[PDB]
Design an enzyme around this catalytic site. Structure first.
Site: not given
Ligand code: HEM
Ligand SMILES: N=C(NCCC[C@H](N)CN(O)CCN)N[N+](=O)[O-]
Ligand code: HEM
Ligand SMILES: N=C(NCCC[C@H](N)CN(O)CCN)N[N+](=O)[O-]
Ligand SMILES: C[C@H](O)[C@H](O)[C@H]1CNc2nc(N)[nH]c(=O)c2N1
Ligand SMILES: C[C@H](O)[C@H](O)[C@H]1CNc2nc(N)[nH]c(=O)c2N1
Ligand SMILES: [Zn+2]
Lengths: 407, 411
Positions: B108, B111, B280, B285
């Protein structure tokens, strides 16, 4: 034991067993991944030679034959005596081709078997190295129809008689630190551009000044040499739509030629093995031209394009980046100089991976380096799982000579 | 053991000591790197130790390590476990645990916002209708009329593995995908299988290119049930381009709230199989992956045609060109409608500051370079040049098998 790698765009799954022959370490452990870190004796020698010979004879379908056992013995004897050995030309050529074949960070390996190897092991001086290098440059450039090549100088002996090409690439532009504190030319080469002067070079102090070669033969101090200009193919950079583009005063050289690596074959070390193929567009257009610590020309180009550079979210940098790279490729193609775009190169690598998986049982690949510095996910390799591991023969990094040389 | 990572753009070097606390495995060995591999019931025996390591981290975090409250708590849990084979977290521990699982999520890039997580405790939930209600409140709270607020809703933990709570949807809001008999796909191809399960469960598919899927919720290990999220609760953004008036005519739109709902939250050994969370979007994405992946909406060509780009040869970089515009459009449309969104330049710069802070105040920040670097313009963002160390810390968010592959249907 038998690992599988999946391509998430095509669901194709390949099984890797080649990793089982891995010999060197990766930098990683089961507790930590260092996949993104840039740089993670007669008794020592013979086993290495043996591993190599076995794979060599195995490749020619003569594994365990008399020839094999014979050569194995001959090498064994030679090592015991001289505490080292010499490869047969056939082994030299096989070793080099395979070191390229095994370079996990190279996206252009589908070309691996076509490598022209130049045996410069009989070389004894810097002038001799300059001669060999000039010939390499002319052969590889081939008037724009680039051909891959590697020139191999004498292997290491006692470590005090090493041949080294001090340049990082045979052809690069000078970088000088001006009073302004700013940097003229290529910033990555600021220091080298200084060690040349600390040697006598007369820097024309320009933006694109082809650096002089600083060759080190047999351990002695290095010597400067100006590569014959007619041997250095350069490409004036213009955009197929923006006439003003040329006014940027941009150009690049057509021959990329890594000269600071070390080649390992059967335990033998070759500290001077400059090699070259041809550019993938993005190396120049994305990294050399847009890196913040390189020519850093994004702003200038964005300005000319008159884009809203007030907010990052207008993606002006991204917009400009694309135009710039369209230009690089346009210029090269127009001058009939070999070059390949990231879409085509990555498409090649996927085919290559498939061939290596079916014909060799795998293909070591470093995702972090294989995926292009722009448009990552619209290229096929982004969606391709890759297993990274170290196989020999190989190309390895080594300390800049100016941080080891005893003048 | 100390470990350093260097940023080759600034030469800033950092030292990691936090990795020493890493217990879980990475997938890599001394001989191989699986850094690019997508996916590399407990016993009392194993539980208490996980509980202890967690409570120790928690009590250290509040500056009460070794206190009587700490000692009593450890004793209380120890007892509860041997007594019931499990244990219940205090609200404070749950909030702390959830925040740290986000803090520890190496993939993520957002963070820097970890400490502002709003945690909704739904451990008293017993039915799917209850789940639906909790999920609706999370969506309205998180959406906040376009000014998104990060949040997570935590349903009852796993017990014997036969009474799991699960959200079968992969994200709370996603569009249906329909395979047509001619082999083409209508809507989002990524959701075709889930969409079929929904139709089979009784959902009446409107069969359009952007149909918001219904929630398929499972409580206490029972068969999942369907529910339509109230339309007024789903914020959507029509996509148009600031300079290309024909863009709007592509008929594209996306939802504003990204909400992962298929992951597993592990805290002190406890397993929370239903823990939907949201933050958000980062523009790419949607603009790069959702719209341009060949296996998703795959619109590069159509946008390419409309722009009248030379599509004869890849070296024209028409795909690259169209990609940027599409991404300019996504950011522009969201900003216009005042729906929270962050571009990759801004998001990556923030992650670098966050990362530096974490090394200095925490001793490290586990990060997955492969995922952190954006799917477009990689090297013109600071993270490309940043070395990173990837390792697994708990609390954590883990992948879990899709429920339709493990569920025992009771009928
Ligand atoms: C505040 C806004 C946030 C932004 C801008 C953000 C952005 C992202 C992005 C760009 C990714 C990769 C998504 C993808 O390529 O599919 C990601 C993955 C991840 N984020 Fe964040 N994130 C945010 C909030 C959160 C929150 C609230 C949590 C958990 C409480 C979180 C947990 C994770 C986790 C666990 C992953 C890995 C998902 C996976 O392995 O499939 N994120 N995030
Ligand atoms: N900004 C966030 N992005 C993670 C969820 C969307 C992602 N494109 C779907 N996805 O990981 C599809 C399967 N690989 N998270 N978040 O704000 O909590
Ligand atoms: C013929 C065309 C070739 C293409 C298109 C190609 C392309 C590339 C690219 C894009 C990189 C990464 C460059 C960077 O980011 O700095 C690379 C790295 C590398 N290539 Fe190739 N290559 C080619 C030929 C060769 C040849 C002939 C050799 C050697 C025999 C070779 C050996 C390697 C090695 C060892 C690396 C990694 C070097 C490092 O770690 O800095 N390549 N190649
Ligand atoms: N196409 C090739 N590229 C490798 C050398 C050029 C690289 N951009 C410089 N480089 O590795 C910068 C140091 N990190 N090779 N080749 O064809 O032989
Ligand atoms: C820190 C990180 O390892 C570094 O920036 C890497 C990323 N990927 C790369 N990939 C290629 N092909 N070339 C590079 O120089 C790099 N630099
Ligand atoms: C095979 C490869 O690991 C896979 O495509 C990864 C690469 N990096 C990624 N990075 C992010 N943020 N999201 C992804 O889905 C992926 N996919
Ligand atoms: Zn690794």
């Amino acid at each position: 034991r038998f690992l599988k790698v999946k391509n998430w765009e095509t669901d194709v799954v390949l099984t890797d067993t080649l990793h089982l022959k891995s010999t060197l370490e990766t930098g990683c452990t089961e507790h930590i991944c260092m996949g993104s870190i840039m740089l993670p004796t007669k008794d020592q020698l013979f086993p290495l030679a043996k591993e190599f010979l076995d794979q060599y004879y195995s490749s020619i379908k003569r594994f365990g034959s008399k020839a094999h056992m014979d050569r194995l013995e001959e090498v064994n004897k030679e090592i015991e005596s001289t505490s080292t050995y010499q490869l047969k030309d056939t082994e030299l050529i096989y070793g080099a081709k395979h070191a390229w074949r095994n370079a996990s960070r190279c996206v252009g390996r589908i070309q691996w078997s076509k490598l022209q190897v130049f045996d410069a092991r009989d070389c004894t001086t810097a002038h001799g190295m300059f001669n060999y290098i000039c010939n390499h440059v002319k052969y590889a450039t081939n008037k724009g129809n680039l051909r891959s090549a590697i020139t191999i100088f004498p292997q290491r002996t006692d470590g005090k008689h090493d041949f080294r090409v001090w340049n990082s690439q045979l052809i690069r532009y000078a970088g000088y630190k001006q009073p302004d504190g700013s940097t003229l030319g290529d910033p990555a080469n600021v220091q080298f551009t200084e060690i040349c002067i600390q040697q006598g070079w007369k820097a024309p102090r320009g933006r694109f000044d082809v650096l002089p070669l600083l060759l080190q033969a047999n351990g002695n101090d290095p010597e400067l040499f100006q590569i014959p200009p007619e041997l250095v193919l350069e490409v004036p950079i213009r955009h197929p739509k923006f006439d003003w583009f040329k006014d940027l005063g941009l150009k690049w050289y057509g021959l990329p030629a890594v000269s600071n690596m070390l080649l390992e074959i059967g335990g033998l070390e070759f500290s001077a093995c400059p090699f070259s193929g041809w550019y993938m567009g993005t190396e120049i257009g994305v990294r050399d031209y847009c890196d913040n610590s390189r020519y850093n020309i994004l702003e200038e180009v964005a300005k000319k394009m008159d884009l809203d550079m007030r907010k990052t979210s207008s993606l002006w940098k991204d917009q400009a980046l694309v135009e710039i790279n369209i230009a690089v490729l346009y210029s090269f193609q127009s001058d009939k100089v070999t070059i390949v775009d990231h879409h085509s190169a990555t498409e090649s690598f996927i085919k290559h991976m498939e061939n290596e998986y079916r014909c060799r049982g795998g293909c070591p690949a470093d995702w972090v380096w294989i995926v292009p510095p722009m448009s990552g996910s619209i290229t096929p390799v982004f969606h391709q799982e890759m297993l990274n591991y170290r196989l020999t023969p190989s190309f390895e990094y080594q300390p800049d000579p100016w941080n080891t040389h005893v003048w």
